[PDB]
Scaffold this motif. Structure first.
Motif, mmCIF file in Angstrom:
data_model
loop_
_atom_site.group_PDB
_atom_site.id
_atom_site.type_symbol
_atom_site.label_atom_id
_atom_site.label_comp_id
_atom_site.label_asym_id
_atom_site.label_seq_id
_atom_site.Cartn_x
_atom_site.Cartn_y
_atom_site.Cartn_z
ATOM 1 N N UNK A 197 -4.988 37.450 40.368
ATOM 2 C CA UNK A 197 -3.818 38.175 39.897
ATOM 3 C C UNK A 197 -3.355 37.722 38.520
ATOM 4 N N UNK B 184 -7.157 44.876 36.133
ATOM 5 C CA UNK B 184 -7.507 44.342 37.444
ATOM 6 C C UNK B 184 -8.274 45.367 38.269
ATOM 7 N N UNK C 277 8.203 40.668 52.541
ATOM 8 C CA UNK C 277 6.788 40.493 52.233
ATOM 9 C C UNK C 277 5.919 40.907 53.417
ATOM 10 N N UNK D 263 5.938 44.685 53.719
ATOM 11 C CA UNK D 263 5.063 45.272 52.712
ATOM 12 C C UNK D 263 3.598 45.143 53.106
ATOM 13 N N UNK D 264 3.186 43.958 53.567
ATOM 14 C CA UNK D 264 1.794 43.769 53.967
ATOM 15 C C UNK D 264 1.415 44.699 55.109
ATOM 16 N N UNK E 292 2.229 36.463 44.145
ATOM 17 C CA UNK E 292 2.697 37.193 45.318
ATOM 18 C C UNK E 292 3.208 38.579 44.945
ATOM 19 N N UNK F 293 2.356 40.427 42.284
ATOM 20 C CA UNK F 293 1.231 41.262 41.877
ATOM 21 C C UNK F 293 0.333 41.571 43.067
ATOM 22 N N UNK F 294 0.110 40.584 43.937
ATOM 23 C CA UNK F 294 -0.799 40.780 45.052
ATOM 24 C C UNK F 294 -0.366 41.879 46.000
ATOM 25 N N UNK F 295 0.944 42.056 46.176
ATOM 26 C CA UNK F 295 1.483 43.079 47.064
ATOM 27 C C UNK F 295 1.920 44.326 46.307
ATOM 28 N N UNK G 232 10.563 29.581 49.954
ATOM 29 C CA UNK G 232 9.703 30.368 50.832
ATOM 30 C C UNK G 232 9.923 30.002 52.293
#
Lengths: 404, 224, 81, 49, 124, 146, 195
Positions: free
Chosen positions: A16, A43, B9, B12-13, C21, C23-25, E87
């Motif tokens: 990324x 990408x 998160x 979203x996944x 995170x 960008x990945x999602x 987190x």
RNA sequence: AAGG
RNA sequence: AAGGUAAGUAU
RNA sequence: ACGAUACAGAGAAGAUUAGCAUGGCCCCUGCGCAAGGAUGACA
RNA sequence: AGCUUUGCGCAGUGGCAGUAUCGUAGCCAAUGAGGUCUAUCCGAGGCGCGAUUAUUGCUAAUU
């Protein structure tokens, strides 16, 4: 067909990071940036492409000349004690045991509004020095708990403050009397009449845990978290031996009353008994698990006791060069281990179990649990007279114990 | 050094995975690799889906609808059962989660019980130590009952709770700590009428100090 | 300082946790929406006249409107003065 | 947008009550406390209009 | 490395255990995020322990928390990362201080007590 | 914008006080950085709105459009669909001059509702599918108010 | 914006504002005199008059806030004393806060809800705002006790309210303000008025 | 297809 | 005098 | 240069229609994953 | 050996609402988003923009 290629492209993990994407694209020879191609399109293109494809010697000589006569004299003292009738030795033994079991909390004074990390008795057994985390060291009268000479202290938490062995007895109050260690590694010397430090020993860029004088009163031993311990000479005003033998940080240092030996207990879970006369590790302690937070050479001259996180206090015999007894003292991390200053009358242990315990030095059996306090007992000390016990704690208070 | 995920998160996944799966299924159907999905039909949905067919052949349409529902249920059960922990595999997971790594260190707790005459209590201690891999020894005297228990911190905590609340003369924790290596085996419940041979047996393992502490504490309690 | 990726299983330096995170999602729906938007705003014909044409039209208006502009004032539609 | 600090929002549901009460105060100011009490009559047996 | 002002710093194993407990507390609605909420919990005495990061810049913005912990007799520990701590709390934004609250009958009580015992024997 | 300004300034002042109580950044570097951050946030709040494109009117369309059915379509048909109470109110008798029932609006009539010639002996019941209901967000606000 | 261009635009706006105000007032005078006019010109004139009246009202409220209350203490004392003496002479008992177990509590709520619904008695189409308000009325009717509890809570604790929209009924002689209150507050106001 |  | 043209395709 | 003729003429209205699945929300059930809680059992 | 808690998946059955669901290489956010009530108290996303039959697909008709 191409649908399966698209399915493969989804399963391909692609970095990324834009710089990493550009580096990977350039490694494969493809153009880094097409016209109007943003980082996301870059990408996507990468995904599709991947889918397709001399002072030391003098100091040692002085230490040897100071220590050999003292070791000899201790030897004839032990021989004379052997000549003493066994009935007298036994009788004084139960007298000491009965005296210890009568100990009570004599006094309870708030050293400071912050936890007290160390407490040390003056050589005349009339003054008590307490080291606090607030960066202030305080001197307290022993018979009656009242502040008499505060110190400006350090800026970080003070680790330990130890009286000079000849202080309050021979040397003048204006001279050096105390050495205090801080959480930033700074070591400052003190006088009984000046609140400000007399001198500031430097060189410890990392935190030093304990600082204690040699029994001769000329050498000051400092243990740093650099896996090292240093010996500072007052007369030379320069560190002598920055020995590096511990695999991890060095916490505590204990000196021999004869002055011949020095014992370092560090976070390596192992202890080393260095020779001050030759600078070689004579005996290597082994058996403790986890960091060792306490060590004190017995006045007998052949017994060493160490306290660690194992909730144990291992006694080490120098004559046999091996451990002799493991005392499972307290139910929390053991910090302070100290014998009777005069002789091997008993063993005093302190731990994070907000309690202190007393053990017969020969037999290693409990006599009196110094129950009390409400916070972890960081440190303890026994006066030269031997009937005074001080135990600082996380409770912001230090307590005195005398037989009643 | 794992990184946890926020609830947004996770949503979203899950959403993007389900969307990708749906798009893949739609592409398979459109490309011809997969037949188009037949409408889902239930008993309440029978007429709304095939009223014209249900009128002419009521029982046949009912049988077809029930066959589709049973096929869906059978697929659900096959998915659930196919992915089911074998009975031996359930034990293997359980037999491993309770096996702590004593390579770094062993946690040792010492207990002194005034009376341990009850055989049921003896069996409780033995079985609980055996299941928790808590190697140790039990020495029986008139008043002193040294229960040395060594193993993992979780097992030590469970066993301490065991005699502190689950099992009832009183139970006293002498000393809880750690040592470099283990020194006793499985529960044996040695009988020690006299103190000398009990101390000798504790010296055989090199842990006579536990016996010394238990005896001294019992003597002090008796004097008190 | 490498932290395991919860979405891909690889390791990234801790300096790039949040960006990796985010960008990945990133939904490809965003990519297609941006492409659609780019297609729309780069294909619509301009409705109003260009600036020079606006200036020329205003100059013609001023020439033919002397009741508002100029020094001398002729009729509303006349340009002589 | 502005905030109302002086006057009333006469479109409120209870604005009729406020207006009538304030007008009753006006009538007290105009008639006075004696003529108004004569017109209203004694509180035990109030007069009609 | 890390700021020496954060002397009760946890090692890797304790860091992992603390982050796991913080996540479990967040799942059980027993966690408060942020230094201000940690201060509020400390003042109300409903905090089991305070976990704060060592990457806060400047670190002095949370160095008041150890003093309040000492005053209120609450264990406290320093973790090496303010991003992993956030987190663990369930928030993508970094968190420099989190407080685990007291809930009677909570199934996390044993783990909370174990973590308190581990922390209170690690500061020195 | 003064409430958000007060909150942000209070947060930064708390940070500065925590820094100050330890006698750190005596020069004021932390204070200058915090003030610069506050000024940047204030400027962002005062930033003029960006250029926003005008949405043109959709071109009229006459092509056929296929719309799905199902439970949602059935419910919308049930809601918007004509109801017997409304079907009967749309019918007005021929030559049966009724009486005015609403002073405030003339011409208004119930039609065949409760009138002779409707052909129904019993009155039509109220369709519960046309019952008034509040929005989901409005329901959330009402729940929050409780 | 550069200062010369800013001054140019300011002069433009000043001239346009003068023309706009004069046109609005002249058109309104024509409307009042009975001049034959279209619907678009009347709608534009009503909009301009709303803008002008609301600017005047903003100025008036600002003046009241800057110059303080216009009633001096002495006049306020006289008015209040007159009211107090009148109320004491009539032996008036102050109206209490509506009790929780008020007997007529539901009758007043029913009357208020019916009065709120009177605006849709002859309606044929419903706005989204009208739909929401009428749903609120139906919900309050379905659960009268919950609505009454909310009303009491508003009467006891609510001191801040949402903005109200204003419009003007264009009676050709004069503009009549029309205020749009939030439906949630409208129910409380209607019940309070009835009680 | 026819007209002027 | 208007506000009253169907829009066509063919011949 | 219209107009006359022959033809068309509804000369003013995306009038669309059902089924299912997805998606949102809320449980319930089963299975998997990672953690944990409380308790029972003699020689 | 069973039992049971929490979170995450995967499915099954069922209920509810389509004035709402998403998108965020836009911005801000536990170093505090947002605060009508409870304010030396509350504690999490908000805003802007975009998509749309107020989520989106197929299927069947007419075409």
């Amino acid at each position: 067909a191409e649908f399966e290629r698209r399915k493969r492209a989804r399963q391909i993990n692609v970095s990324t990071d834009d710089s990493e994407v550009k580096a990977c694209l350039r490694a494969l020879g493809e153009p880094i940036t097409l016209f109007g191609e943003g980082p996301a399109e870059r990408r996507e293109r990468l995904r599709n492409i991947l889918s397709v494809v001399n002072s030391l010697k003098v100091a040692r000589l002085w230490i040897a000349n100071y220590s050999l006569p003292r070791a000899m004299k201790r030897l004839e003292e032990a021989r004379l004690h052997k000549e003493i009738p066994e009935t007298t030795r036994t009788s004084q033994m139960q007298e000491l045991h009965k005296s210890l079991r009568s100990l009570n909390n004599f006094c309870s004074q708030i050293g400071d509004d912050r936890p007290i990390s160390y407490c040390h008795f003056s050589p005349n057994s009339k003054m008590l020095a307490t080291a606090c985390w607030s960066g202030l060291c305080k001197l307290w009268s022993v018979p009656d708990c009242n502040l008499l000479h505060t110190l400006r202290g350090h800026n970080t938490n003070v680790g330990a403050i130890v009286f000079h062995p000849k202080s309050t007895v021979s040397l003048d109050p204006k001279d050096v009397n105390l050495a205090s260690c801080a959480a930033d590694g700074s070591v400052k010397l003190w006088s009984l009449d000046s609140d400000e430090p007399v001198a500031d020993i430097e060189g410890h860029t990392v935190r030093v845990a304990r600082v204690m004088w040699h029994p001769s009163g000329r050498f000051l031993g400092t243990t740093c978290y650099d896996r090292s311990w240093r010996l500072w000479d007052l007369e030379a005003q320069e560190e002598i031996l920055h020995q590096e033998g511990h695999s991890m940080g060095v916490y505590d240092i204990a000196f021999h009353q004869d002055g011949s030996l020095a014992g370092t207990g560090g976070l390596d879970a192992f202890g080393r008994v260095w020779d001050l006369r030759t600078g070689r590790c004579i005996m290597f302690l082994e058996g403790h698990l986890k960091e060792i937070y306490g060590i004190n050479f017995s006045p007998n001259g052949y017994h060493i006791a160490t306290g660690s996180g194992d909730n144990t206090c291992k006694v080490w015999d120098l004559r046999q060069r091996r451990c002799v007894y493991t005392i499972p003292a307290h139910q929390n991390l053991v910090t302070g281990v100290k014998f009777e200053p005069i002789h091997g009358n008993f063993l005093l242990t302190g731990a994070y179990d907000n309690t202190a315990k007393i053990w017969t030095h020969p037999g290693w059996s409990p006599l009196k649990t110094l129950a009390g306090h409400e916070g972890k007992v960081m440190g303890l000390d026994i006066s030269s007279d031997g009937q005074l016990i001080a135990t600082c704690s996380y409770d912001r208070t230090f307590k005195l114990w005398m037989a009643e | 050094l794992g990184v946890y995920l926020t609830k947004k998160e996770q949503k979203k996944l899950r959403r993007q995975t389900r969307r990708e799966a749906q798009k893949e299924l739609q592409e398979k159907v459109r490309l011809g690799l997969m037949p188009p999905p037949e409408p889902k039909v239930r008993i309440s949905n029978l007429m709304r889906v095939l009223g014209t067919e249900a009128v002419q052949d009521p029982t046949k349409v009912e049988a077809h609808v029930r066959a589709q529902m049973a096929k869906r249920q059978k697929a659900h059960e096959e998915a659930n059962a196919a992915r089911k922990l074998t009975a031996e595999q359930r034990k293997v997971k359980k037999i491993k989660k309770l096996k702590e790594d004593i390579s770094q260190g062993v946690h040792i707790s010492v207990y002194r019980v005034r009376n341990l005459s009850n055989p049921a209590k003896k069996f409780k201690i033995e079985a609980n130590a055996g299941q928790l891999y808590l190697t140790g020894v039990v020495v029986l005297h008139k008043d002193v009952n040294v229960v040395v228990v060594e193993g993992g911190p979780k097992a030590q905590k469970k066993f301490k709770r065991l005699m502190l609340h689950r099992i009832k003369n009183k139970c006293v924790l002498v000393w809880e700590g750690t040592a470099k290596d283990r020194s006793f085996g499985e529960m044996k419940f040695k009988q020690c009428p006299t103190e000398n041979m009990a101390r000798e047996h504790f010296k055989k393992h090199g842990a006579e100090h536990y016996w010394d502490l238990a005896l001294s504490e019992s003597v002090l309690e008796s004097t008190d | 300082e490498y932290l395991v990726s919860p979405i891909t299983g690889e390791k990234i330096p801790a300096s790039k946790m949040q960006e990796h995170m985010r960008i990945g999602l990133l939904d490809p729906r965003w990519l297609e929406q941006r492409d659609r938007s780019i297609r729309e705003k780069q294909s619509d014909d301009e409705v109003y006249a260009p600036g020079l044409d606006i200036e020329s039209s205003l100059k013609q208006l001023a020439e033919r409107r002397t009741d508002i502009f100029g020094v001398e004032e002729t009729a509303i539609g006349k340009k002589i003065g | 947008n502005h905030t109302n600090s002086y006057g009333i929002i006469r479109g409120l549901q209870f604005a009729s009550f406020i207006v009538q009460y304030y007008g009753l105060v006006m009538d007290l100011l105009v008639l006075g406390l004696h003529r108004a009490s004569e017109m209203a009559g004694p509180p035990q047996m109030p007069n009609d209009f | 490395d890390v700021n020496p002002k954060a002397y009760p710093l946890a090692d890797a194993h304790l860091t992992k255990k603390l982050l796991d407990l913080v996540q479990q507390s967040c799942n059980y609605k027993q966690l408060r995020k942020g230094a201000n909420e940690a201060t509020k919990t400390l003042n109300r005495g409903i905090s089991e322990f305070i976990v704060m990061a060592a990457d806060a810049e400047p670190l002095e913005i949370i160095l008041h928390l150890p003093l309040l912990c000492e005053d209120k007799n609450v264990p406290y520990v320093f973790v090496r990362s303010k991003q992993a701590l956030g987190r663990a709390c369930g928030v993508s934004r970094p968190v420099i201080a989190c407080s685990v609250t007291i809930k009677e009958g909570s199934q996390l009580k044993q783990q909370i007590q174990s973590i308190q015992q581990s922390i209170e024997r690690l500061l020195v | 914008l003064r409430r958000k300004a007060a909150r942000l300034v209070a947060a930064k002042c708390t940070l500065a006080a925590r820094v100050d109580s330890f006698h750190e950044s005596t020069e004021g570097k932390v204070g200058y950085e915090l003030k610069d951050e506050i000024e940047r946030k204030f400027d962002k709040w005062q930033e003029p709105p960006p250029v926003k494109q005008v949405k043109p009117l959709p071109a009229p369309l006459d092509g056929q459009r296929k719309k799905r059915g199902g439970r949602r379509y059935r419910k919308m048909k049930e809601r918007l669909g004509l109801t017997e109470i409304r079907k009967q109110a749309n019918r007005m008798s021929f030559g049966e001059i009724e009486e005015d029932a609403y002073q405030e609006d003339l011409g208004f009539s119930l039609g065949h509702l409760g009138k002779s010639g409707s052909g129904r002996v019993r009155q039509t019941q109220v369709n519960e599918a046309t019952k008034a209901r509040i929005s989901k967000t409005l329901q959330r606000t009402l729940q929050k108010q409780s | 914006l550069p200062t010369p261009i800013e001054n140019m635009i300011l002069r433009y706006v000043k001239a346009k504002a003068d023309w706009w105000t004069n046109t609005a007032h002249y058109n309104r005078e024509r409307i009042r005199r009975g001049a034959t006019v279209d619907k678009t010109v009347c709608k534009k004139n009503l909009g301009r008059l709303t803008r002008l009246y609301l600017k005047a009202e903003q100025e008036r409220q600002h003046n009241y806030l800057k110059d303080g209350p216009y009633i001096t203490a002495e006049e306020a004392v006289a008015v209040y004393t007159t009211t107090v003496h009148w109320l004491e002479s009539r032996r008036f008992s102050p109206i209490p806060f509506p009790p929780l177990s008020y007997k007529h509590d539901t009758k007043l709520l029913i009357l208020a809800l019916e009065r709120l619904k009177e605006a849709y008695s002859v309606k044929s189409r419903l706005n989204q705002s009208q739909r929401e308000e009428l749903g609120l009325i139906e919900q309050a009717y379905d659960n009268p006790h919950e609505a009454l509890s909310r009303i009491k809570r508003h009467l006891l604790t609510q001191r801040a309210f949402k903005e109200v929209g204003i419009e003007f009924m264009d009676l050709y002689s004069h503009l009549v303000p029309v205020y749009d209150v939030e439906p949630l507050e409208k129910i409380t106001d209607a019940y309070l008025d009835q009680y």
